[PDB]
Amino acid sequence: TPIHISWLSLSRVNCSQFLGLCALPGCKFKDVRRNVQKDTEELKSCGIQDIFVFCTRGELSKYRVPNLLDLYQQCGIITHHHPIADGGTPDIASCCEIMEELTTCLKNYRKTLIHSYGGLGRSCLVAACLLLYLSDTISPEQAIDSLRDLRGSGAIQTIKQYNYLHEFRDKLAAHL
């Protein structure tokens, strides 16, 4: 099979663009045997221009895709690797850099895709953060609902992540 991308509409934050989310491309784990090169080519063939990866180095090793980043760039895709702990959250400085690189991809009209291990939690956390980021009217609860509607009730994984969403605005406000 291909690799499925779940496209998030950003119209709720006044944006014509869509943001793509997915699970680990080329992942090879129990019962899951993907072809990292075919997947890459597929994404490339789809028009993907920029890809954000939140999987750590260890994971890329575990799931036998250590040169994931390599392959993406070999295919002409700009790769944004910002490791976030499985079940964890990004510090404010890193999450801030992610928001900025994402916003730029959109303002440039770049077909953008983001992924974690299972595209459910770390990825939804960043996606939901981007909604709060681009809108000052949407609630954490609402941003969570939008991703829940896209990824399922398991959109956000841990209460640590829920906790980050609530107050992400305040933590981000903390700007010296």
UniProtKB/Swiss-Prot annotation:
Induction: Up-regulated in breast and prostate cancer cells. Changing N67K: In HCC; patient BX-10. One of its GO terms (molecular function) is protein tyrosine/serine/threonine phosphatase activity. Residues 9-176 form the Tyrosine-protein phosphatase domain. One of its GO terms (biological process) is G1/S transition of mitotic cell cycle. It catalyses: O-phospho-L-tyrosyl-[protein] + H2O = L-tyrosyl-[protein] + phosphate; O-phospho-L-threonyl-[protein] + H2O = L-threonyl-[protein] + phosphate; O-phospho-L-seryl-[protein] + H2O = L-seryl-[protein] + phosphate. May play a role in cell cycle regulation. Dual specificity CC phosphatase active toward substrates containing either phosphotyrosine or phosphoserine residues. Dephosphorylates CDK2 at 'Thr-160' in a cyclin-dependent manner. This is Cyclin-dependent kinase inhibitor 3. It comes from Homo sapiens (Human). The chain holds residues 25 to 200 of 212 of the full protein.
